[PDB]
Subunit: 505 residues, 2 copies
């Protein structure tokens, strides 16, 4: 018979909720847990904002779209287990405008944006129209290996992880045997592929990004009708021990001089919570770094990983309109996204309100990196109440982006005066949007992040603690692996076998 | 004989005020200007926060310290022109603690922080105690050329501008003939030299940084007693045309069909302001990118520079204490700064309150880059009203850093309950702290940033538009050069000769 044991789950985002879900399913005798969440809200970076309780009157601030690819099977299994209402998500849609250098994209035209050397810009003529082809040449080998087997493909990709994307493109790969691109070529590739400055982060992250968004299998995409927070609701409801909100862990410790299994503790608001046999930390790493972890005696390079692994910013801005003018006036009738070099960068047309003719939400701006920091600087806790600079910027950018069909006056007139925006680097409980590692970090720092700690009783868990950054799948894989390690540590072979039987696939 | 002319100055930080100062001094017949400032406040990144009107009861949120080196002579000339009360600033002081991996630095100790491979960390033994020497070897040749002649030195440095600092250290310079360092060596150098992740930005910025902070001349440093905002006050006072605050420019244009000198205009709150013969934009580039600039017909690569040139974040946190416990109890009696891998990263002991025995301000945290974003996530426009996570974090970090003489209890007891913090990336009027360029940007994008525009009538001015990022000197040089180009364009030879006579040196 198993002795009584308690574990501690720090954070109630999807990782922490998944750990609890797995433990609840295994039903290990005399095992209990505490889940502590710093926010008044549960769900973390699963976060649907509802303007009203009307059917489609929402947008997803965090996770919103899911590609049905093999590496994400665990995510779709969670969806199935919790009865999520899935509907099609249109990554690409009809008639979505693309605007660069104040020109609209045109199929079959040489340099439609007029940015090549031939037209007075500095993008090389042989690059301006062929970003797709040239990035497929840069990323494709690795994408194919990842599709064959993600783990093996990842291990192969790590052999060039010392390079940034820019460095890879500049030098022609590891041996100089690939094409070499000049600064302006690489700049245009970045502009057409990702957020501002992100080619100066890891080549491996750009490859994995391309694998997820431009997967060789050309997958179907899905979203959750009613918002991703429906998943948080579902996971919360099954909990044998409910989330304790407004509980911010500020320290984690192990008492190595104590003989007991339950010799770990955490500190919350100056008070000790003790008796834990294992602690699963599931917070973003910036939050973890703020804790006093001296009581864990972490390897110094593991500590370095917590402080230094790079996070990217992300900002979303959603506006309500009295009618879906992008559908009715612009012929944008089935989702997709408009891309531009204007400040809003990306305008996402919702896939969940396609048949509505009344009030409708538009995800008017979705940005990463420096673009997100810049939009984020206009996003305030208490929005300007009386002129709102962000609203005016978004309306002006939307007018330019949809100029083939709309005017600023008509868009402003359709705008209801209700909007919401969110900058993830401004969230105290995350401090960024997600991990997006710098050069060398996956191959050098990440293995120390994942190093056993406190004699195998402390786990650093979450999307950053995975090879699938910025996806639910990374959070879930990280959680599963940590539960495996926990069961193994305490030699619970019956329940480890059960874990593999029920939860591996 | 000179026709009436009007110019527009966008922004009233130190660049904008300096343009006006020069124009006011040259007294060109029939020339006037408008200065439009978006904020209700004048001064921009010159910004002293006064807790009360008591003598030393302030800290500088922006610029605060000035090295007396030749390349910054124009800054000290501005100080002299305006009667600034300068006092000594102690960059290095006595008894300032350094805390890494929970160990305190001590001179002569081998691997005091226990991070060497020999002691179970991953920092190579031949690097751990010799970061200074190794970075001087990497930067030194260029620092010396910059000392001989900054312009010539810069031009030589541009020949390796394609590399990040990490890339330079990794590959052994451009030919592999310098020492090559592994990931963990470079990581430790970054940790000991700058903010988290900044070695993944331009090598040239790391060099120029080292040149300014560790100049070969071993300079005296100064600060302005009473706060840097005294300079803003003095510059405002002399203005022939006063700053117009709460005037945010949202568009800039030239009418090329009009034959007049004054064929430029700007838009503010939807209203046109016309008749300008030249427009000087002095805002941070993020603010400029948000404007509608179509009316200027900017070269596409100049537009790219505005969007893409990289900015770094910076955050400051200042606490008031009932007595200067760092002076009285820790023997830190003459300024300097404490450095640590704890979240606060750098604690700066003020140089302006050394003889005070009552209330005193401490610049408890000064951070850059990801460190600043993480502290910044706790800095709110409306500070939490009665528990503040940021305050508690700073108090706990201060206790650890000063554990040789203080306890948390004593520091908390000394804390008055009054503090202020500021994260520059969260300021709508800047959107970052300052330019800190990525690899290749100085050598490729920057020349297009500085390209003549609107037929020589539009100027992009400010610290980013200079080779001295993050210093007043960059702003002043940028302003001076733009005024030169303005006088040249309109062939005002008498006044151009006067500019050279009075303002070159
Ligand atoms: C803008 C954005 C868009 C995204 N898009 C998608 C998408 O389309 N599809 C997809 O699959 N994924 C997407 N992702 C990723 C997905 O949202 C995340 O990977 C996942 O939600 C992360 O879950 P987590 O449990 O690892 O971390 P979190 O969600 O961060 O959960 C950690 C929890 O810990 C809490 N916490 C923090 N500090 C403390 C403390 N001291 N004590 C106690 N608790 C604390 C936090 O409040 C939080 O609730 C997106 C993410 C973002 C930010
Ligand atoms: C944290 C920090 C520490 C620093 N430390 C030092 C130091 O120790 N020593 C040193 O010499 N230098 C230092 N610097 C640098 C120095 O502060 C700056 O380089 C200088 O103040 C920038 O002046 P500027 O005129 O170029 O830009 P800004 O100060 O940004 O002025 C531009 C003005 O334009 C306004 N504006 C923005 N948008 C609009 C619009 N649409 N319409 C109208 N107006 C607009 C802004 O509000 C602002 O007032 C520091 C800077 C920071 C942020
Ligand atoms: N997965 C998130 C964002 C993201 C994806 C991949 C990344 O590498 C980084 C961020 C989305 O759906 O937009
Ligand atoms: N000059 C600012 C900060 C700074 C200095 C140099 C840089 O390259 C960047 C930022 C200071 O005194 O702290």
């Amino acid at each position: 018979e198993l002795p009584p044991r308690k574990v501690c789950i720090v954070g109630a985002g999807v990782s922490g909720l998944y750990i609890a879900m797995i433990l609840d399913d295994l039903k290990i005798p005399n095992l209990t847990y505490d889940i502590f969440e710093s926010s008044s809200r549960t769900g973390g970076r699963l976060y649907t904002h509802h303007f009203t309780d009307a059917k489609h009157d929402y947008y997803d601030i965090g996770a919103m779209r899911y590609p049905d690819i093999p590496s994400m099977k665990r995510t779709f299994n969670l969806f199935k287990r919790t009865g999520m209402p899935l509907i099609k998500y249109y990554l690409d849609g009809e008639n979505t405008p693309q605007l660069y250098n104040n020109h609209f994209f045109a199929k079959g035209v040489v340099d439609p944006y007029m940015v090549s050397v031939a037209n007075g810009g500095t993008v090389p003529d042989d690059v301006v129209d062929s970003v797709g082809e040239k990035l497929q040449q840069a990323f494709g080998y690795y994408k194919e290996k990842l599709a064959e087997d993600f783990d093996k493909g990842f291990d192969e990709l790590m052999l060039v992880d010392d390079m940034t994307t820019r460095e890879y493109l500049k030098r022609g790969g590891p041996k100089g045997e690939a094409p070499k691109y000049d600064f302006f070529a690489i700049q245009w590739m970045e502009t057409q592929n990702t957020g501002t400055n992100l080619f100066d982060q890891a080549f491996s992250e750009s490859v994995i990004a391309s694998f997820d968004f431009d997967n060789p299998t050309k997958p179907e995409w899905y979203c959750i009708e009613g918002g991703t927070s429906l998943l948080v609701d579902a996971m919360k409801e099954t909990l044998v021990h409910k989330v304790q909100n407004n509980k911010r862990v500020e320290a984690i410790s192990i008492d190595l001089d104590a003989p007991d299994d339950g010799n770990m503790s955490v500190k919350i608001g100056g008070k000790d919570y003790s008796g834990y046999s294992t602690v699963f930390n599931t917070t973003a790493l910036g939050c973890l770094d703020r804790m006093d972890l001296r009581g864990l005696n972490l390897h110094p390079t593991q500590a370095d990983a917590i402080r230094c692994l790079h996070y990217a910013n992300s900002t979303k801005v959603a506006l309500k309109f009295s009618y879906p003018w992008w559908i009715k006036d612009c012929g944008i009738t089935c989702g997709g996204a408009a891309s531009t070099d204007l400040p809003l960068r990306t305008c996402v047309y919702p896939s969940y309100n396609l048949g509505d003719t009344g009030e409708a939400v538009l995800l008017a701006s979705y940005t990463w990196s420096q673009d997100a920091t810049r939009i984020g600087s206009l996003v305030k806790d208490a929005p300007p109440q009386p002129e709102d600079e962000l609203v005016e910027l978004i309306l002006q950018n939307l007018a330019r982006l949809h100029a083939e069909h709309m005017t600023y006056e008509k868009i402003k007139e359709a705008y209801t005066g209700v909007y919401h925006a969110y900058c993830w680097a401004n969230d105290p409980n995350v401090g960024g949007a997600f991990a997006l590692f710098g050069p060398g970090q996956f191959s050098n720092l990440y293995p120390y992040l994942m190093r056993p700690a406190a004699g195998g009783k402390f786990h650093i868990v979450g999307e950053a603690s995975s090879v699938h950054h910025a996806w639910i799948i990374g959070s879930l894989e990280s959680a599963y692996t940590a539960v495996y390690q926990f069961l193994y540590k305490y030699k619970m072979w019956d329940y480890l076998r059960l874990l593999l039987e029920r939860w591996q696939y």
